[PDB]
Amino acid sequence: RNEEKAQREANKKIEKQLQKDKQVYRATHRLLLLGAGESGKSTIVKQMRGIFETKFQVDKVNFHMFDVGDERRKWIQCFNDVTAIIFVVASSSYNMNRLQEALNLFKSIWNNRWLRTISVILFLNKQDLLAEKVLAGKSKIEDYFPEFARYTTPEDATPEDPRVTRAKYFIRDEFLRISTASGDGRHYCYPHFTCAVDTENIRRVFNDCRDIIQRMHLRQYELL
Amino acid sequence: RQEAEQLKNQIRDARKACADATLSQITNNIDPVGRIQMRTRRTLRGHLAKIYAMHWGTDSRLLVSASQDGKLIIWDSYTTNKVHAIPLRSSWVMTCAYAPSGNYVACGGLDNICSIYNLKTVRVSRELAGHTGYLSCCRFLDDNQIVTSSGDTTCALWDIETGQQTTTFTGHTGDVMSLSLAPDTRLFVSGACDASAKLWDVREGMCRQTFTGHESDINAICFFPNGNAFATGSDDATCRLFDLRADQELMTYSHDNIICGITSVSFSKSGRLLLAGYDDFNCNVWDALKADRAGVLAGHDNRVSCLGVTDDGMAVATGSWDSFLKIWN
Amino acid sequence: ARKLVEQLKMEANIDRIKVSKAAADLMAYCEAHAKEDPLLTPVPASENPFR
Amino acid sequence: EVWVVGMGIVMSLIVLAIVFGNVLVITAIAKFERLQTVTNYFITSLACADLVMGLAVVPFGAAHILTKTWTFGNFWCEFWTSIDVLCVTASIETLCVIAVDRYFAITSPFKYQSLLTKNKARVIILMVWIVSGLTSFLPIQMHWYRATHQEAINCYAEETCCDFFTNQAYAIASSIVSFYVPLVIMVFVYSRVFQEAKRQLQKIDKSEGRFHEHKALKTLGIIMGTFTLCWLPFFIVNIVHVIQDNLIRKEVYILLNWIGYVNSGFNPLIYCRSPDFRIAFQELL
Ligand SMILES: Nc1nc2c(ncn2[C@@H]2O[C@H](COP(=O)(O)OP(=O)(O)OP(=O)(O)O)[C@@H](O)[C@H]2O)c(=O)[nH]1
Ligand SMILES: CN[C@@H]1CCc2c(ccc(O)c2O)[C@H]1O
């Protein structure tokens, strides 16, 4: 008799609480920080200012980053509703092959069935070390990666010796070749060049997330 | 160390000699059950995000579900009104459980920790740690001992009073995805990612038998009500019925029109109907004995990840990524 | 490697029964308990709590 | 004779299409929960307005045109005129609201969720409908709009002829409130949207052009063109026939007014082409 009314009141209270929680849920934007082993993941996170969570806001916008921590990845189906993916790779480890493993990992991530609508932000760390080995060493990418001989810088791209820029563009285009192969217009990639001392990473992520949401909304209305 | 091949050949020869006639041969002449039509009776809403797990209560009245918004909600099926809402420390949960006594609720996820809550006091009671990987499933064996399986190819039996592992089960190669307990709560099985299902002994703590019918990862498993058989589901769109005493499979359920995976498997009270959920946003109802379809449970806009049948077998509940739960009768 | 070798010998020494007996037992159980499942047999609306 | 006959068949076909499209859209929205989005409340309000107009005012107008004599009382003449004005002036502000919603969605992605909520949408729709009905029923049911000319006096006196005669003030006010004000908003909003789309396309081309504005131009072109073509000539002849006496004949006025009514038969063909709507229509007949 009265138990039904008491249960109704409890249901009303629970619904009132859930309605208030929904707003704070919808406000935040989630990200996944996925990088290869030994690829500078620790620094980029540390110098910004079994699992790890990070809270930070830019211009009154809440972001929430997750670092996972298995060669096989069965848990990746749980990350199909994130805003973007931050991929961290060491650009200077082409001889220690670590770079080829990173390329295969990126290819596996891109063409997954459950990640059909997730964009990837690419960070190319260790610019100083790559430049040092490119300019001051007898070893050349040519040996490690053979095709390097044919590629010549894109005429349009900005730039420094004429060899370091060529190497960086070769690496970036080796990634963009996989990037532009499939996926139609559902998701994109935004390559970036980053060193340890760089301080603008938090602004770059903000801009990229804004562009991602803008492009999704534009595509939804048959305008792009 | 070439004797290992000799033992495997011995096992294969014994299994081949054991078989006399197919299951379909014996059960061919029984009458079919005909078309079975099911209609939605209740719809439960209130979850902000997708659902991964659920478990009916032992009284066939209360059920619990866990979503990725980081919240456990205990429903009331009869009057479609909530009772409890428990926030979580971490927002990633992959499993849930309901104690047989109706007093405790457990949940664990991507963090390598199994948590236990005290409904009748709602604050955390214990935190069981020691696994090195994400948890996949957990079942209350009693009010003070719980068995769990994690992603590090191991299973453990815990003690809630002290929070320390009592027995550890090892032997698998790939990740463990599910487990279920026997009707007498003396044995339990497990399905791994190496396409192999094993049968353990809780008291002894040593593996007993192994079945290797499938060709891909196993995502679900459940016992027959009799207690001498169990059926699994895999990524190759096949459900196979094994048997403990004979020690080989008897029947496979497959169709040419399905190429998707399987996420849940359950039986009916009489064991005549086998219910499975697929990635095609709908569930199928199979015939256990004659291996023939008898109905479809459609109505979900996204994939189905959970499914369970009440102890009294009065209804079946399905959960999906569309953040909804439905009760079918 | 001897640990793995021991298990293979251990699992081999179990008595087994023919498929016919197991299939007959399953069919007998399913036919015996067939009259006590609301899913298979549509019960009257009087006893159904979801209507 | 034959002309009278023919007019009928096409008028009945127009009525049937206007009713059928709107009722199908409403049924599809109501039946399925996958379409119960915030943006779909404005669309269902527009669909209800178009359905009400097509079901109420078109048949009686057709009967008046064909029989050349109105067979109901003065009260029903005023009632029909009021419903016509209300529906016409409520079927455009909803399109303005939709344009503003798309503007906010595209230009400010980080604040779209907070700005628009299921609670505020009802307030906006109620405000639009109230302000629409305030300019239709209030000055028509009462006799402010009535004119004092020699023809108008006989028209209001007789119980068989129900024509539209108005003074300058009411016509100008109604036209400005209904059409001219909700046009500059559309133009500004869609100009900004097109500029943003062009900027995004240029960014993509500069980013990954080597390995790899038509759709946006076509979409904005059809959306603006159908509405402007349908409703622009009428809202110019409306002003100019009051500015100058005997400048424009009544027959072309009625023809342009009827051209305006065709617009309600195209909104389902414009705002409801999404894959979800297509699947819903395929499932439901
Ligand atoms: N000179 C230089 N050293 C760098 C730069 N970025 C990273 N390092 C070095 O790389 C080391 C950290 O990278 P790793 O240890 O490979 O990886 P981590 O970031 O520590 O952790 P994981 O990324 O999770 O493996 C530090 O000791 C840094 O000194 C850079 O831009 N310049
Ligand atoms: C009888 N037909 C009416 C006459 C004038 C008028 C219409 C519609 C909207 C207006 O703002 C109007 O002033 C027409 O539908």
UniProtKB/Swiss-Prot annotation, chain A:
| Spans annotated as G3 motif | 63-69
InterPro entries, A to Z = Gprotein_alpha_S (IPR000367), Gprotein_alpha_su (IPR001019), GproteinA_insert (IPR011025), P-loop_NTPase (IPR027417)
Q: What is the effect of changing D128N?
A: Increases binding to GAS2L2
Residues binding Mg(2+), per UniProt: S42
According to the UniProt record, where is the region G5 motif?
194-199
Q: Where is this region: G4 motif?
A: 121-128
Q: What is the effect of changing R72H?
A: In AHO; impairs the ability to mediate hormonal stimulation
Which Gene3D superfamilies did the record assign?
A: GI Alpha 1, domain 2-like, P-loop containing nucleotide triphosphate hydrolases
Q: List every position bearing Phosphoserine.
A: S182
Here the segments flagged for biased composition (Basic and acidic residues) are 1-11
Question: Cross-link position, Glycyl lysine isopeptide (Lys-Gly) (interchain with G-Cter in ubiquitin)?
Answer: K133
Task: Indicate which residues the UniProt annotation says bind GTP.
Answer: 35-43, 67-69, 125-128, 196
Keywords, alphabetical: ADP-ribosylation, Cell membrane, Cushing syndrome, Disease variant, Dwarfism, GTP-binding, Hydrolase, Isopeptide bond, Lipoprotein, Magnesium, Membrane, Metal-binding, Nucleotide-binding, Obesity, Palmitate, Phosphoprotein, Proto-oncogene, Transducer, Ubl conjugation
Q: Where in the cell is it found?
A: Cell membrane
Look up and give the membrane topology term: Lipid-anchor
Q: Name one GO molecular function term.
A: D1 dopamine receptor binding
PROSITE patterns per the UniProt record, alphabetical: G_ALPHA
Q: Where is this region: G1 motif?
A: 30-43
Result of changing S91R: In AHO; may alter guanine nucleotide binding which could lead to thermolability and impaired function
Protein family according to the UniProt entry: Belongs to the G-alpha family. G(s) subfamily.
Q: Which PANTHER family match?
A: GTP-BINDING PROTEIN ALPHA SUBUNIT (PTHR10218), GUANINE NUCLEOTIDE-BINDING PROTEIN G(S) SUBUNIT ALPHA (PTHR10218:SF357)
Which disorder is it associated with?
A: Albright hereditary osteodystrophy: A disorder characterized by short stature, obesity, round facies, brachydactyly and subcutaneous calcification. It is often associated with pseudohypoparathyoidism, hypocalcemia and elevated PTH levels.
> What name does the UniProt record give this protein?
Guanine nucleotide-binding protein G(s) subunit alpha isoforms short
Q: Which gene carries the instructions for this protein?
A: GNAS
From Swiss-Prot, chain B:
- SMART domains according to UniProt: WD40 (SM00320)
PROSITE patterns, A to Z: WD_REPEATS_1, WD_REPEATS_2, WD_REPEATS_REGION
Spell out the family assignment given in the record's similarity comment: Belongs to the WD repeat G protein beta family.
| InterPro entries (UniProt xref) | G-protein_beta_WD-40_rep (IPR020472), Gprotein_B (IPR001632), Guanine_nucleotide-bd_bsu (IPR016346), WD40/YVTN_repeat-like_dom_sf (IPR015943), WD40_repeat_CS (IPR019775), WD40_repeat_dom_sf (IPR036322), WD40_rpt (IPR001680)
The record's account of how the chain is modified after translation: Phosphorylation at His-255 by NDKB contributes to G protein activation by increasing the high energetic phosphate transfer onto GDP.
Residue spans of the WD repeats? 39-87, 88-129, 130-170, 171-212, 213-256, 257-298, 299-329
The protein, known as: Guanine nucleotide-binding protein G(I)/G(S)/G(T) subunit beta-1
One cellular-component annotation, GO: lysosomal membrane
> Which Pfam families does the UniProt record give?
WD40_Gbeta
A Gene Ontology molecular function term of the record: GTPase binding
Q: Signal sequence span per UniProt? A: none
Impact of altering L23F?
In MRD42; uncertain significance; no effect on protein abundance; no effect on complex formation with gamma subunit; no effect on trimer formation with alpha and gamma subunits; no effect on receptor-driven G protein activation
- Chain's role: Guanine nucleotide-binding proteins (G proteins) are involved as a modulator or transducer in various transmembrane signaling systems. The beta and gamma chains are required for the GTPase activity, for replacement of GDP by GTP, and for G protein-effector interaction.
Keyword Phosphoprotein listed? yes
Does the keyword section mention Phosphoprotein? yes
UniProtKB/Swiss-Prot annotation, chain C:
Q: Which domain of life is it from?
A: Eukaryota
State if Iron is listed as a keyword. no
GO terms under cellular component: extracellular exosome; heterotrimeric G-protein complex; membrane; plasma membrane; synapse
Tissues showing expression: Expressed in fetal tissues, including testis, adrenal gland, brain, white blood cells and brain.
One GO BP annotation is: fibroblast proliferation
Topology of this chain in the membrane: Lipid-anchor
Example GO molecular function: G-protein beta-subunit binding
Question: Is ATP-binding a UniProt keyword of this protein?
Answer: no
Q: Where in the cell is it found?
A: Cell membrane
Protein keywords: Acetylation, Cell membrane, Host-virus interaction, Lipoprotein, Membrane, Methylation, Prenylation, Transducer
Which family does this protein fall into?
Belongs to the G protein gamma family.
Main role? Guanine nucleotide-binding proteins (G proteins) are involved as a modulator or transducer in various transmembrane signaling systems. The beta and gamma chains are required for the GTPase activity, for replacement of GDP by GTP, and for G protein-effector interaction.
Protein name as it appears in the record:
Guanine nucleotide-binding protein G(I)/G(S)/G(O) subunit gamma-2
Q: What is the lineage of its organism?
A: Eukaryota, Metazoa, Chordata, Craniata, Vertebrata
From Swiss-Prot, chain D:
Q: What is its main location?
A: membrane
- Spell out the GO cellular component terms annotated for this protein, sorted alphabetically and separated by semicolons: apical plasma membrane; ciliary basal body; cilium; clathrin-coated endocytic vesicle membrane; early endosome; endosome; endosome membrane; Golgi apparatus
Which residue pairs form cystines in this protein?
C77-C162, C155-C161
Report the subcellular localization.
Answer: Cell membrane; Early endosome; Golgi apparatus
Q: Any idea which residues bear Phosphotyrosine here?
A: Y112
Segments on the Cytoplasmic face: 30-42, 101-121
Phosphoprotein among keywords: yes
> What does the entry report about post-translational modification of this chain?
Palmitoylated. Palmitoylation may reduce accessibility of phosphorylation sites by anchoring the receptor to the plasma membrane. Could be depalmitoylated by LYPLA1 at the plasma membrane. Phosphorylated by PKA and BARK upon agonist stimulation, which mediates homologous desensitization of the receptor. PKA-mediated phosphorylation seems to facilitate phosphorylation by BARK.
**Topology in the lipid bilayer:** Multi-pass membrane protein
Annotated binding of (S)-carazolol, by residue: D84, S174, N257
Q: Ranges in the Extracellular compartment?
A: 67-77, 146-167, 244-250
Q: Which family does the record assign?
A: Belongs to the G-protein coupled receptor 1 family. Adrenergic receptor subfamily. ADRB2 sub-subfamily.
Functional note: Beta-adrenergic receptors mediate the catecholamine-induced activation of adenylate cyclase through the action of G proteins. The beta-2-adrenergic receptor binds epinephrine with an approximately 30-fold greater affinity than it does norepinephrine.
What's the protein name?
Beta-2 adrenergic receptor
